[model samples]
Target: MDDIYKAAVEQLTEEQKNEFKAAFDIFVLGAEDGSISTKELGKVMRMLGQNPTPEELQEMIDEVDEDGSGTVDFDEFLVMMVRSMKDDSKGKFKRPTLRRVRISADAMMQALLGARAKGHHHHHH
Candidate 1:
């Protein structure tokens, strides 16, 4: 119901609430229907400099389409915004840890591959 969205909006800081409303309106593009379609969602992501693939874009929409309306209404968009903000802070920590793991994995793979190649050459002699 519309009241659910109103309650969610109340949970945001005044500035955040205003900013989110502004963004939602921009994405809606003057449509009185009050929802952002998948096409609009793609445009919004690209506007943020992200090039999401079609599958990724659809997945994003599916995540927020609580009523299966095939579009994101204000309440769903607000939920996504809040969840993303939480992830933003957590991602700072996750990035460094993930990078370290990737680096170690790469190094280990290189060492094993180099050793195996060298041993194979010696067997040819």
Candidate 2:
């Protein structure tokens, strides 16, 4: 793990971590376990290749999603790059001076794998 990843994992509160884990688990496993952790994310990262890890996708989420719905809809996703990245009053994420990094299908694929690591990680499976 890199310094940023280590810091985010270390700084995140237990509740936030749990929420993150649950969201990841729900998305990945396609089930509801109510809990998931960095420990689980590690396993998922291995299953998916490297480039952008769960941390990247999640950081993007934290940077984007403000509603805490635990998922980023299209509107939120768009706001993340066009507006949310610039909003400083929310205090949710650091406003970026540079352009937001767009989430590609490849990143989404990795996120899906991280999300599905729960017991089922897949509705079809």
Candidate 3:
């Protein structure tokens, strides 16, 4: 409905765009007032790898809370997402990145055996 919103996600690959939309839908579902509260905000911050202090959270809200509600509506949440991307290295947030270190099945087996031979690997429950 909002072209600004459309443009905000334009940088994402199609798959990433779908995933973002699905996640936003779920967040909207979670917010009883159609907006995210401080608790929810803190949860999001933690997920971004920043366990924000209460003051920091409030500061973030103040920065993005265009409405007077003191809570972040969906649009504000989107702004935060885009801002995080734009300022990723400036330390606005630390979004996780996944790195794959794949090995062939045979290589995995050999590695496992070599590690076992050294008694260097331990079992986990």
Candidate 4:
């Protein structure tokens, strides 16, 4: 409502726009498929502010799934971000210290496997 996106965008500097553009580009790159997974949603929510609870994570997923299709598309994500600005919700769930992480199933799997492999290697050594 009220051209929410333009209202938010107007407050941003050109630098901010460029930064968001880059982020949006990367999001589009990762969101190649029509939907975004719950795992992906968790990582994004964590980036937004204090790590959300599993329940909170699910809420974020639901909110972004404007079309109830499961994964969030480009439009849904943009809408979410704009909506976030409406109530000082931006970066509310994602902590600044935790912002650097981009958790994914692949990364989580790799970390798990690497830990297991390290234990095995240590046992052998």
Clashes of 2: 7
- Full-model lDDT, candidate 3: 0.51
- Residue pairs in candidate 2 whose N, alpha carbon or C atoms collide under 3 angstroms: 28-115, 28-116, 28-121, 29-116, 29-121, 29-122, 116-121
Where does candidate 2 stray beyond 4 Å? Answer: 1-50, 84-125
What's each prediction's TM-score? 0.55, 0.28, 0.46, 0.43
Candidate 3: pairs in clash:
none
Q: Score each candidate by Cα lDDT.
A: 0.56, 0.43, 0.51, 0.49
- TM-score of model number 2: 0.28
TM-score head-to-head 3 vs 4, winner:
3
lDDT of 1 by residue, 5-112 (tens): 446667889756655665667666644587877677666656555566676666676765757776767777676665444433244454453122111212322322
Expressed as tens digits, the lDDT of each residue in 1-125 for candidate 3 is: 23554467676676555444444454444567866566666665455444666766666666556665767665665555554445433644545554221123223223223322342454783
Candidate with the greatest TM-score versus the true structure: 1
> CA lDDT of 21 in candidate 3?
47
Q: Check candidate 4 and list the clashing pairs.
A: 36-71, 48-94, 49-93, 49-94, 49-95, 50-93, 50-94, 50-95
Which of 1 and 2 is ahead in lDDT? Answer: 1
Q: What ranking of all candidate models by TM-score puts the best one first?
A: 1, 3, 4, 2
Clashes of 4: 8
**Pick by lDDT: which candidate is best?**
1
Give the C-alpha miss distance for residue 64 in model 3, angstroms: 2.2
TM-score, candidate 1, is 0.55
Model 3 bad stretches (over 4 Å): 1-18, 25-30, 87-125
